[PDB]
Amino acid sequence: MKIEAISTTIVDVPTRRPLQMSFTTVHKQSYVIVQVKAGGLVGIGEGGSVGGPTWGSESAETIKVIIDNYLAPLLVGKDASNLSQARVLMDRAVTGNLSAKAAIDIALHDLKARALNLSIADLIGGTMRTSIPIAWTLASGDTARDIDSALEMIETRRHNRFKVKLGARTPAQDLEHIRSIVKAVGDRASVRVDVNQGWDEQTASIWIPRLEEAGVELVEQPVPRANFGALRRLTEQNGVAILADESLSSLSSAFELARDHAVDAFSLKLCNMGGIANTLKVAAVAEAAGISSYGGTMLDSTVGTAAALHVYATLPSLPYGCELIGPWVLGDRLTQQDLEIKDFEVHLPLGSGLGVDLDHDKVRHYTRA
Amino acid sequence: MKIEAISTTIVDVPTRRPLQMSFTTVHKQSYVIVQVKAGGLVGIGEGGSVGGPTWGSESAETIKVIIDNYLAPLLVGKDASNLSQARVLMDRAVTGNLSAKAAIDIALHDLKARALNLSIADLIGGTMRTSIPIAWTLASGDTARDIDSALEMIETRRHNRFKVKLGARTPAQDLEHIRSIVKAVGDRASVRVDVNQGWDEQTASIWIPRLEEAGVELVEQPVPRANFGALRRLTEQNGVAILADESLSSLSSAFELARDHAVDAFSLKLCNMGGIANTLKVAAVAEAAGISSYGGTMLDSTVGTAAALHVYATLPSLPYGCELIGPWVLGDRLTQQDLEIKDFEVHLPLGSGLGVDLDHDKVRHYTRA
Amino acid sequence: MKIEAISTTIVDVPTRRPLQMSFTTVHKQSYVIVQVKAGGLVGIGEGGSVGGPTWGSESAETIKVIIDNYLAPLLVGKDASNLSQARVLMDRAVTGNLSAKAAIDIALHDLKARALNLSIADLIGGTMRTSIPIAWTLASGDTARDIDSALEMIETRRHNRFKVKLGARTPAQDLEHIRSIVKAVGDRASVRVDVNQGWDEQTASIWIPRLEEAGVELVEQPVPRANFGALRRLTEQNGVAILADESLSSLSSAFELARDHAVDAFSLKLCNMGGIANTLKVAAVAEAAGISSYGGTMLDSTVGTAAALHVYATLPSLPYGCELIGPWVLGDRLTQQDLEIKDFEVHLPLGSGLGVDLDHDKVRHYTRA
Amino acid sequence: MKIEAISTTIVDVPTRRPLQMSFTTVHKQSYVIVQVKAGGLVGIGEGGSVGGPTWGSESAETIKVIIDNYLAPLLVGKDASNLSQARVLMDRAVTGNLSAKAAIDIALHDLKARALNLSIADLIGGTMRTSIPIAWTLASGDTARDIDSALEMIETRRHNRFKVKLGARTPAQDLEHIRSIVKAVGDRASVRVDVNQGWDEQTASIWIPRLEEAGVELVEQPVPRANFGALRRLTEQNGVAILADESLSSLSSAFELARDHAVDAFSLKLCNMGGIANTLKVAAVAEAAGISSYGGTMLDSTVGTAAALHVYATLPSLPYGCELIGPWVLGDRLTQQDLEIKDFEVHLPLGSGLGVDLDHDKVRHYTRA
């Protein structure tokens, strides 16, 4: 059906815990909820970012303006079902702004899938799994608190995979923090870390081996995003798997990292990659090059999380599971239904499209003036 | 719907012209027509090969046995709509035999698309084009005859892109043959060549430059398929684009050729790559690496040709068009409808699924005893 | 003498123990027994594969059809003694299908050698050894059972070299399994492993060092066959020798692996390499590049095993011996005589040709209808 | 049969034309005729070298002493038919001295083949050809004389492939010399050159392109034998094929040149490579790496030439033919029969073994005191 209109709504949703960034602690996450109307039906999407233009160069503000002034005008009047043309049109009209493009792409997939009475995962080709082991990020900043948090998640059978943020304290302090957590969880959980580009090469070369010795199973983005050479050397010299996050963006960057096996795994993220088809292309490059696919997140609401789940549910292998905990870090929901986490895994919501619908009262409430 | 059964039928269809191979001239092409039955509906597919185990290691005989004894048994009872699982199940149960897997994959896509009332191209994401410039292969073995053939195709507006098979005669003879054709067609047509692995590196290094000087626009598989190093060196040293054909098979081989830009283009072929999803993964690697996608053929009947057209219709760019002339090299059709070539391009057949249906009377007639 | 005819017979021989494959446990091995008749005399060969199209893309079914429809017709009428021409004719007429070609090549060598009253090993140039240390594969799936099996083989002086299949259980479980076996056999036996492409690069990079520390002397195909880069990196970073199995096929692949010492050893296998001359060419590349030759097997019957023994008996060095235990895994014999294993080594059967003859009553009995 | 004795005889045979070397013009070639006696039968071999320790480090004198004092003593008492053990025993007892080893290896092959009533080519596996296009070396030092010589060889249908020695005169003079020859022979002959290590890299980089432009089809050893880097760069930058001669010796050197395609072709020479099996291993490496095999010569007598012919007759491809003209450069024959050159090719002598026998009266006459 012809696209009638594309609306963008910036919603500010409070987070249950503060978000420490550079030199400003955020108390909420901002999203751009996208709604595509065609043939009376509606498809929804989400344009995300972490704490503003910090994780990436996009923000809820840039996303809305990019869609409103450039992307939306170009798509109105076009066949909503032609996902191929929609993707190419956006790429040829706007450079970068992958998150804004992803919000629209997700909405178009939701709309098309519903029209066919299929889940997005089914539209893509079918599910390989209906649930995915999910990792919980421990970053309270306190060792004792993190240990209690982890033991709690394990006992309630919600999470037995944890990601610890490192880089803020000293390397020595980070190692002790990790050793304490590993000792506490024993053989009941796996521990991964994310240095968030916090170490230079020599620091990472010294401490990654110690992290591995301490029991760490995965080290995410230890060095600055542009330092592909350091990543490759660290990956070649260490047994523990290295995960690329910020180093990934375009399909080209995926190929570049893959070329000489600069990392062992790619953190797939719908928003930073530009959408579903684009994320699947990156996953194809990883599969072709012998690199693992990881289900990454941008602390998305239920809309973005559902979108990511449908994509990851179709991949052949997810050796490290996913980290789609956004809906639980937020203090409220923007959708009518909630996602389910049971027996250490997050479950794919049933139904056509994303399997989740916008709670207009919630969206209305959190819409920023 | 649950897969009820998968039938395989070897059909031998006479070719309008002989097929010179090694030391045996074939007078027909053999296909394995696959039919998947689920929920009363049927999806059709084709397992192809060129002149038997010559172009590749598979033949209509190996394909039928592989499907009957290994692949079919594993899929019966499974959800026909789960293309993801079907693809993975086949890959984990059988090594290689990509053509046999492709026949089943095409049938499953046809079945699923029809059930949704979509063309396969629409199911994949939507068309970027509804017609594709098509190249005609000139290989009568006679210069005068080829020139008449080309002028005829140009005047009737059927083809203005021609592929000349080289390697049989001497390099000097091949060059004169090419020069005569180029002089004859003038600025009304483009000339490409396929050496079919016929030259060693030094021979190719000497004559490719001469072919380029003569006006050739694309040189396909000049050296043996396993010689990736020679391909890379020839590609680095020559301006004329080099196309990989036999060197491509698995997704891994695509990545290997892409890694150091061993060629400028990949000849996509559904059967030698294992299916639609697999071919799309190869196309994604090419896109990621800056390598062109070419619509290749295995002299397929209308079934296989339609399948390939639906896939290529969705790709962002086809700088050299395609060569899906199989239906016109065959002396008869296996489908009820015929494909249309008009104004130098082959057109995507309208309708759901492949957009073509098996003419059971034709299939019955050419079925081998 | 002129080749009068080439017959193919598919025989299904029960195995003493089940053969766990993907998701189907096989209870027998299928072979294609080839018989070449020329000048009244007969030469025999075997076309093998492991559990069907699993280890490789060929099966007893594809092998028979390839020989019957393509290879056999081309050789009938040709001089059976011209092994050079026979090998080239097959390679130029059929792509791949090395196992089918190997069956015929073995038969031609047997026929020619007998006609000269020489063993095949003598025809090749002469023996360097008349017996070869043989490794027994422990894969009962139970640690206690494997330990009893090994101690038994050691005490009876049949085997003091064991190969343990890994990859099914978790890496941690595999390591404990290995540690238990090593502790049990002490200094009375050597332990090797075959991961059967079961690990990705990071997993192999972590556990191979642990296997080496545990006492493992050889690690076979730890990663997927197409991942030459991972093999090379693992080989460069680990002291324990890495053996290529599935990564080897064509002479070209041997050169590719050898180029940058991607592995320390090549598993020579007559069937997957295309025959005796082809296997000797691969061994020559290994010798030239400083890579070890290993006597590999495809769980062959006495016919294929005898063929392999004659070839390996002529090589200058076999630092890890061989694994030609096929005849003992089978529940019956297809030949009149049995091979002898004594004092930890398998002995070359005396006599001309292969030194073994087909028991027609046995072949007749196991011939599949 | 047990080897009874191995005799060595240095024979000095006058050449029809002088042999200009460094600063001493030789008027004859010296060979070491080897005779192996076992079970009453005799096998003959030849240890060659060009103009003494010039082309290589061996001479008829070193060869005789090496065989008499080291190799012969070790083989007496051993089974003459075990070619595998004979080859390994020699390699483990003596370093280098490949020509001396080759003389014995040829004799053992001759002896074994005769005992089986087979030609050496048949023993190796069978012939691919019974005649080989042969190149004649033009090196009279005079352009007019060379032109007459070539026209004569063409008209008598003896040779239409010529090799011109370069490097003595200036590059400019060599080019004019080549241009004159090419103009004279027209399309009736091909011209190759051998610079005999006479140019440094820059000189070769400038003139090889000019030689190619002038019509040269093959450039042999343009730079010093140890300069593999220069060879590779010249090979990468020029279309005309580059042939390695002096750069080849051990199997290791063959692999080294092959690794990065340092040359397009290898000049196979039985004496400088250590024998038949060793030469076949080098040919296998070339085949594996995509490098051409050329039938090289050391200006051998009929014995060495026959040996080389039997080997080259079995190879799959000889794109540049051979240069086995030794018997015609010599002023007399050491064998009872003469080799035949007809219709531009040299023919494989019929009969078992080498197909040629020593004329004891001739050998006796030319034996040096």
Ligand SMILES: [Mn+2]
């Ligand atoms: Mn690593």
Ligand SMILES: [Mn+2]
């Ligand atoms: Mn991260």
Ligand SMILES: [Mn+2]
């Ligand atoms: Mn180029």
Ligand SMILES: [Mn+2]
């Ligand atoms: Mn082609």
Ligand SMILES: [Mn+2]
């Ligand atoms: Mn190593």
Ligand SMILES: [Mn+2]
């Ligand atoms: Mn193995």
Ligand SMILES: [Mn+2]
């Ligand atoms: Mn070159």
Ligand SMILES: [Mn+2]
């Ligand atoms: Mn030379």
